[PDB]
Design a protein around this ligand. Structure first.
Ligand SMILES: [Cl-]
Ligand SMILES: [Cl-]
Lengths: 183, 183
């Protein structure tokens, strides 16, 4: 409710439609020109961001201290415009929530919003046969085309949607410290 | 915002997924067991409502005083359960609104919600080559699968989504007097 209001503004300011050779995804702008995609989008030296061709200057598939998959890629974009800094909205740790909003911005699902209800700390999961940490789970009658979906509550950006099993969806949690490094 | 809150509860209480031989649609329950579909869903003596087979006892394609298409079919369902009476939420006339929510409940788009912005009294329109009155229009990067989508604002059920042109969506306005007749 206020969660939706927060979600609409978030998507307007910070989200875009991205196409890779791997498919179409939602991208969440974080700060400066640093943005996040789900890992399986596998962005090359160039992406199509909002039907437009933007260079990717740098890309990091993120891993935990053991080399375990976090399912996020951090990209730096070649574009003049700077995202609003949304890092104050990111927790230092996996946040659980009774009521969330998943926000999708593709051409399959343009500016759409789903209430997913209870968001749980699921932990580990095999996703595309890859062991994956820090998954947030919610009861999600899924469909492909929601990868990159931003999962949110009021005042809170919780994570990025990176898969489902038909009946549940999973988000990679967006943690504060993924987003410090250098300048 | 409060519009979303109103929309979630509306869909929970009063909306369903309907399949006809013409496709899959959202159905809005009005009162008692009277419900509405867009006209082009063309429901037979039976529909599939929420993966389940429900008889249709009676069906009226609605027309204005001239026999012009309103693009709504009113169905009476063979089912024990009674819809909550949402007619207090229906205007006596085409309502214009600065900010609306379109709410879709299919298996293509399950429990999804779109902000459409400004809703305008468009008037007449040829829709599937059929002249159609009392269309409400909004800027809608469309897709098939949203027919029956319920268009709403706060405290207001405005109409039922019955088509688009790629760039705009159209709703048949849900007027108070469509829903009096007898018992
Ligand atoms: Cl911030
Ligand atoms: Cl009422």
């Amino acid at each position: 409710g206020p969660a939706f209001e927060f979600a609409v503004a978030m998507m307007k300011r910070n989200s875009s439609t991205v196409k890779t050779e791997y498919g179409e995804f939602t991208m969440l702008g974080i700060y400066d020109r640093w943005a996040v995609l789900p890992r399986h989008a596998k962005p090359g030296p160039t992406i199509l961001m909002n039907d437009q061709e933007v260079g990717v200057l740098d890309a990091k598939e993120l891993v935990d201290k053991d080399g375990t998959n976090l399912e996020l890629t951090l990209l730096k974009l070649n574009r003049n415009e700077k995202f609003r800094d949304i890092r104050g909205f990111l927790a230092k740790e996996e946040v659980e929530v009774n009521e969330a909003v998943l926000a999708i911005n593709t051409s399959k699902f343009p500016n759409m919003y789903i209430p997913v209800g209870q968001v749980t700390e699921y932990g580990f999961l095999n996703l595309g046969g890859t062991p994956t940490k820090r998954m947030l789970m919610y009861n999600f009658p899924t469909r492909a085309g929601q990868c990159g979906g931003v999962l949110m509550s009021t005042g809170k950006v919780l994570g990025i949607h990176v898969g489902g099993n038909g009946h549940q969806g999973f988000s990679a949690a967006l943690l504060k410290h993924y987003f410090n490094d250098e300048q």
